[PDB]
Amino acid sequence: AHSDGIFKKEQAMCLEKIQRANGCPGMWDNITCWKPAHVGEMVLVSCPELFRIFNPDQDMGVVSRNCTEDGWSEPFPHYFDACGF
Amino acid sequence: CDATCQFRKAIDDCARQAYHSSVFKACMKQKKKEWKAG
């Protein structure tokens, strides 16, 4: 698996639609593309798409961030706790 | 280099070592323990 290159393609793919959408800014955390958001709303994402292939039989992973006055919050849970093993 | 930084780095390091997925999980399990220990 050439994960670093797939992530990078996705990072360019990410900046492409952040600009279309634009509260918290659209952002790329180096794992996930976060569609920009209003203060007070919560965005869920799933584990990176690579894992659909790496561990096919596991698909319950969710990661959340809140958009606050102080910008995006930390991931919850952390990517290690929600997408690692 | 924060929790998220280390997970991305973990992914790419393990994805390069492992050629079977169960090797991948193991290297990834190890990368989580390094993260918690640190």
Rounded Cα distance between A58 and A55, Å, is 6
A43 DSSP assignment: E
Cβ contacts of A54-58, under 8 Å, gap ≥ 24: A54/A1, A54/B15, A54/B21, A54/B24, A54/B25, A55/A85, A55/B21, A55/B25
Residue to test with chain A: of B2, B7, B9, most A Cβ within 10 A: B7
Q: In terms of DSSP H, where are the helices of A1-85?
A: 3-21, 50-54, 79-83
The count of domains in chain A is 1
> CB-based contact (8 Å) between A7 and chain B?
yes
Residue to test with chain A: of B4, B16, B17, most A Cβ within 10 A: B4
A25 DSSP assignment: P
Pair A80, B32: CB distance under 8 Å: yes
Q: Which domain holds residue A32?
A: 1-73
Write out chain A residues lying below 8 Å of B16, CB-based.
1, 3
> CB-based contact (8 Å) between B29 and chain A?
yes
Method used to obtain the model:
X-ray
Q: Is residue A31 part of a domain?
A: yes
- List the resolution, Å: 2.7
Q: Which domain holds residue B23?
A: 3-37
> Cβ contacts of residue B20 below 8 Å, gap of 6+?
none
